[PDB]
Design a protein around this nucleic acid. Structure first.
Lengths: 49, 172, 197, 127, 96, 111, 106
RNA sequence: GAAAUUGUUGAAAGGGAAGGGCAUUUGAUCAGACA
RNA sequence: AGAACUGGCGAUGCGGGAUGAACCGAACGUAGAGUUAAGGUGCCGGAAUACACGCUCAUCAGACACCACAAAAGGUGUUAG
RNA sequence: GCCCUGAAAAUGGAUGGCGCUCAAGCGUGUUACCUAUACUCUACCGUCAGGGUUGAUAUGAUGCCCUGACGAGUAGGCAGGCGUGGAGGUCAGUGACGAAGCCUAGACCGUAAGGUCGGGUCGAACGGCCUCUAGUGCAGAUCUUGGUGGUAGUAGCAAAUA
RNA sequence: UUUGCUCCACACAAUAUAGAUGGAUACGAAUAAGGCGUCCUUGUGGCGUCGCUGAACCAUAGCAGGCUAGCAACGGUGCACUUGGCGGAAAGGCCUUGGGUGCUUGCUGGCGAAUUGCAAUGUCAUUUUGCGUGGGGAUAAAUCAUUUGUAUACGACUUAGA
């Protein structure tokens, strides 16, 4: 039968699997869309919290 | 039913001492053999008069060939057909060479356009229209138009092999 | 008959091509299908799109990673249609599907090679004119294939180079035809004409 | 050195093994007919073992014959072998298992004399 | 997107050279030696590879690393990463 | 059953190929007018042609000749039955009933 | 020359079978160039070899042969029935076989 | 001094069971025959 | 749930109906050859991507018995009357 | 008539699937082709029935031979055979130069029950045939007794301040 | 880390073969429209021809293909080299210059080929590995243990250590 009090989903499923990362250095899965008119520059940098 | 033929079937009561020489009813039957022809003869005569195969006799079964199997004719066919809900009469025009070919096309056309079957169809009359303008139907009249010509676009071959090397063409 | 048969999937119907291909495979012919983004399906684009959405909502409810995998590229759509026509859960079917190869576009080892067609699967011969048809690249892009632009760019490049090759080949063919034509008067040529050749 | 016989046919060279003799050790391979109400083997559904029956019977010309075309007759001594003196084409001798080696060599000598075939001549022979 | 080739510098520091090892104290520290020797007069093979990148290479990424020794961590091993370049002319990118 | 009106050719071929007698409960291949005479000389029949004659020109002794004849054990027809479905009437596009003279073709296929 | 072939090359298709039961005592062969039984009638009675290679040499050869013959036609698309002395091993579904031109009647 | 059950060695196979039947291949192994 | 007449399952395999106790076909000694039943012949799958006449386009097509469903009512959708 | 509206359910999803659209759909027709343990012919096995065969050397006449047909099966009935412990008889049977038992992806006979041989181990008795006799044949019975597994080197071996 | 590892050439074994045995012979697009050739005023142009299938084209004669002699022509093809260019979608191949060398069935000839004994695939392919000889080339890491805590049930991860 049905839930009896319609409450919402605990947790976010698009953050699954909630597993260990392969490295401490996370992957940049995307860079900004390139504009072939501006100067040449880096899109990102590396630092330490 | 099959590739058709036309038979004339002549039939008779059995003679009694009371009434000898009965009246010799005949019918033109479209059928694929003499057995089916005699069956249909008795079907229709049973319907019309007090006769059956047991009290009756078949006097002669004769095949009727076309007198002119090369002259292209325009037949009109008067038909009776049982539908699912009801039974109906029809007049169809068929342009063909022979009565028997016309009847073949008629059975196929009624099966196609009315889902009617041989058991369901009675052919009342098949008649040649001698003069044009007595034709009632456009799908026949447009071939009686004067000096008729037309192409066959999109010509498709039939290939012996499975693979080809040309990317063929539908020319004509 | 050839050891490897290269089929140009342009203008072709998916199910019919898959049928003849599957049978050729099981009978032992190595086949490679190319330019499968230009493959055709009968019925309008919206119809086939709804059909694919129906396929795409089918999934194992306790693990969609277990479920039926919905492959989005045209090559793998064709492979789906075709492994449904092979008994792929056996060794014979595995071997057949190893004889098979499918590609989007025409990659380098197979663009310098002759492409055959299959006339019992071509849409321009098999469909009635007026009947609406769908293109697999369009469908696959609608349902989530990304590399439509890339294949187009690369195919343009290929067509340029192939046209150059054909210009050269046509010139050489012209020369050979002129030479044979001037040679088609002598006694040897007359004897060959008598013998059919 | 036998009579001329036809080629020998068998119709089933394969031992009729009992159902589930492979599955359980307690079930031996010796044939037993399944007598169960739901037995696929008794009902002879497709894909199941064959049951023995008399149509697999061997031709009577070729029954009991060995591939040499002799019928094998067990022998314990020279008297039992002189029984076969006059039937060397039909019958071959087989020395019994419980015979000693010295008696075996005696029997084999007498059989070589009388022209009788012996199926187990290498039994209990010092090499 | 597929990596076609990747060009390195002549002199790599002992931090990225460290990144290429799991046991630096035991090693002969032989890494990028034959590459530093591939330079050797002008960078013939190197300009070959850069020309390949210029000709091909829809996009271009630069390999960089960190100055962990300037950082107060006890790690000594730098973090290598690919970073995309944005700007016209993959030629200009690779020349940069 | 499929039945109809046979011809001399069918009768002759059937009696010559599938023709077997009933003698002392036994199905005897005829193969000799001596046999036929030994069993039917009571009735003047003394040859396989005398048999066929009684059969086709139904005679005083048709009963005895026909019961002497063991039932003809025919094969299936070699070109098939001609129809897709057998168990309709011949008139409906089947195989059973009277097929007055189309039975000869069937029986020759079966023989 | 280049060619030394006195055999027409064919392909071993399935065994004789219904939808769910096969018969290994009869094999089906597809012959090249044949597309009708009227053309396969030429090939009836001709002898067939399935030639295969092993690793163990028996009597001077690592090449072994199964001999058969064509028995009758199959279907309408030139497929042919064959029967071999010892039946074919069912891993040769799609394998090449050699239809020789003897026994000849031309 | 059986079996279940186990160890060692050898041989073979192994993509969510194994086992069986018909048929052949491959490997191993084996009986029978000309005077 | 209960009767009638037959046939069957039970007690029975086989080919077909994807699958099924009883439906279709047909009843099993062991083998060989041939022909067929019912059902089928794009591929899975043995066998015509055969031939012929027509109807149908479904932004919920349809697809051959028992059998696994669909109605009243409607539609210048199209077809024939 | 086909198509459409009418036409709404609960895991994901079934003209059997793929897929099919002048179709691989619907209606009808024509042929070819596929194939069952069915039909035909042949062989072999058994069963039944009908018959022949004193001729002897010399034999099983409860034999040999010929002919024809048949062959599904639970419960159940009958028949012919296989095997086990013991009894009478017989083979002047086997056997410490090795009985019986045990093992043996080694061989042979029999439709089968089962029998026979070879090799190994073994260490004292055992068998074939004609007959008698029965505490005579196991897969089950939450069967009896005994032994052994997987579970599994797992649960766990943590109250009582050390 | 015993003078081991690897590439190439040759030789010998083993390994198996989803399975050669003349050639996978390269435009693109349309199809109620196109290919080829040709001409001009270069176009959505004019003229001619083609297609109705690849049953085409190419190659193909020689002891599984031998040894020799000329004629004609300066062509064709193979091998190993050599020049230069194009190749990135899986380029790993395509084209090209030059010379050398072999063959040439384009034509005419000469010798040989028997006995595998009336057929038996009658073996003339590809792959993988190993051991030998010849040359060429290069002379590292990872794990355990110790340690760290950006980590952690244990593994694992992250670090450090001549």
């Amino acid at each position: 039968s049905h839930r009896k009090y319609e409450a919402p989903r605990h947790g976010h499923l698009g953050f699954l699997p909630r597993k260990r990362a392969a490295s401490i250095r996370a992957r940049v899965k995307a860079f900004p869309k390139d504009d072939r008119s501006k100067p040449v520059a880096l899109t990102s940098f590396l630092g330490y919290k | 039913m099959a590739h058709f033929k036309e038979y004339q079937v002549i039939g008779r009561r059995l003679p009694t001492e009371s009434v000898p020489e009965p009246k010799l009813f005949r019918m033109r039957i479209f059928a694929s053999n003499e057995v089916i022809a005699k069956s249909r003869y008795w079907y229709f005569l049973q319907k019309l008069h007090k006769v059956k195969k047991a009290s009756g006799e078949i006097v002669s079964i004769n095949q009727i060939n076309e007198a002119h199997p090369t002259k292209v004719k325009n037949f009109g066919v008067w038909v009776r057909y049982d539908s699912r809900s009801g039974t109906h009469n029809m007049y169809k025009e068929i342009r063909d060479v022979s009565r028997v070919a016309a009847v073949e096309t008629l059975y196929q056309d009624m099966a196609a356009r009315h889902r009617a079957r041989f058991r369901s169809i009675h052919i009342l009359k098949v008649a040649e229209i001698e003069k044009t303008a007595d034709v009632k139907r456009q799908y026949v009249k447009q071939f009686l138009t004067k000096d008729l010509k037309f192409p066959l676009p999109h010509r498709v071959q039939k290939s012996t092999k499975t693979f080809s090397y040309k990317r063929p063409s539908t020319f004509y | 008959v050839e050891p490897v048969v290269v089929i140009d999937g342009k203008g072709h119907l998916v199910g019919r091509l898959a049928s003849v291909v599957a049978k050729q495979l099981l009978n032992g012919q190595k086949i490679v299908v190319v330019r499968a983004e230009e493959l055709n399906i009968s019925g309008e684009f919206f119809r086939n799109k709804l059909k694919y959405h129906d396929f795409l909502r089918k999934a194992t409810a306790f693990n969609k990673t277990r479920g039926p995998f919905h492959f989005r590229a045209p090559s793998r759509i064709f492979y789906k249609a075709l492994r449904g026509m092979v008994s792929h859960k056996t060794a014979r079917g595995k071997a057949a599907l190893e004889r098979l190869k499918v590609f989007e576009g025409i990659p380098p080892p197979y663009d310098k090679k002759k492409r055959v067609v299959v006339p019992q699967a071509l849409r321009v011969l098999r469909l009635k004119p007026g009947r609406k048809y769908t293109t697999l690249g369009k469908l696959s892009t609608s349902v989530g294939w990304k590399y439509e632009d890339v294949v187009a760019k690369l195919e343009a490049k290929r067509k340029v180079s192939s046209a150059e090759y054909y210009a050269k080949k046509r010139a050489f063919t012209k020369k050979v035809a002129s030479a044979n034509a001037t040679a088609a008067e002598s006694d040897v040529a007359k004897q060959l004409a008598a013998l059919g050749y | 050195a036998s009579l001329p016989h036809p080629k020998i046919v068998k119709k089933h060279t394969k031992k009729f093994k009992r159902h589930h003799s492979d599955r359980y050790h307690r079930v031996a391979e010796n044939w037993r007919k399944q007598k169960g109400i739901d037995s696929v083997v008794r009902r002879r559904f497709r894909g199941n073992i064959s049951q023995p029956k008399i149509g697999y019977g061997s031709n009577k010309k070729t029954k009991f014959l060995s591939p040499s075309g002799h019928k094998t007759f067990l022998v314990a001594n020279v008297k039992d072998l002189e029984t076969l003196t006059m039937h060397t084409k039909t019958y071959a001798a087989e020395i019994a298992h419980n015979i000693s080696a010295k008696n075996r060599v005696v029997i084999l000598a007498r059989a070589k004399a009388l022209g009788i075939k012996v199926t187990n001549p290498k039994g209990r022979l010092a090499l | 997107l597929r990596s076609l080739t990747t060009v390195w510098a002549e002199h790599l520091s002992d931090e990225v050279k460290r990144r290429f090892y799991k046991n630096w104290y035991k090693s002969k520290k032989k890494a990028f030696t034959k590459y530093s020797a591939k330079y050797a007069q002008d960078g013939a093979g190197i300009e070959r590879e850069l020309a390949r990148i210029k000709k091909y290479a829809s996009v271009v990424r630069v390999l960089v690393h960190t100055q962990i020794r300037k950082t107060p961590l006890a790690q000594k091993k730098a973090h290598l990463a690919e970073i995309q370049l944005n700007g016209g002319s993959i030629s200009e990118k690779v020349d940069w | 059953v499929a039945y109809g009106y046979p011809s001399y050719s069918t009768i002759r071929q059937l009696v010559y190929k599938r023709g077997f007698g009933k003698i002392n409960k036994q199905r005897v291949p005829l193969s000799d007018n001596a046999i036929i005479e030994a069993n039917l000389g009571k009735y003047g029949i003394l040859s396989i042609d005398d048999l066929i004659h009684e059969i086709i020109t139904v005679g005083p002794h048709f009963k005895q000749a026909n019961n002497f004849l063991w039932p003809f054990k025919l094969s299936n027809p070699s070109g098939g039955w001609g129809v897709p479905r057998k168990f309709k009437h011949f008139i409906q596009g089947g195989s059973f009933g009277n097929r007055e003279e189309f039975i000869n073709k069937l029986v020759k296929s079966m023989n | 020359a280049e060619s030394h072939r006195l055999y027409v090359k064919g392909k071993h298709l399935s065994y004789q079978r219904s939808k769910r039961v096969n018969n290994p005592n009869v094999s089906l062969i597809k012959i090249e160039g044949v597309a009708t039984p009227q053309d396969a009638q030429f090939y009836l009675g001709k002898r067939i070899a399935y030639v295969y290679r092993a690793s163990k040499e028996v009597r001077g050869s690592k090449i072994r042969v199964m001999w058969g013959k064509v028995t009758r036609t199959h279907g309408n698309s030139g497929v042919v029935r064959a029967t071999f002395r010892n039946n074919l091993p069912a891993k040769t579904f799609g394998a090449s076989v050699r239809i020789f031109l003897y026994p000849s009647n031309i």
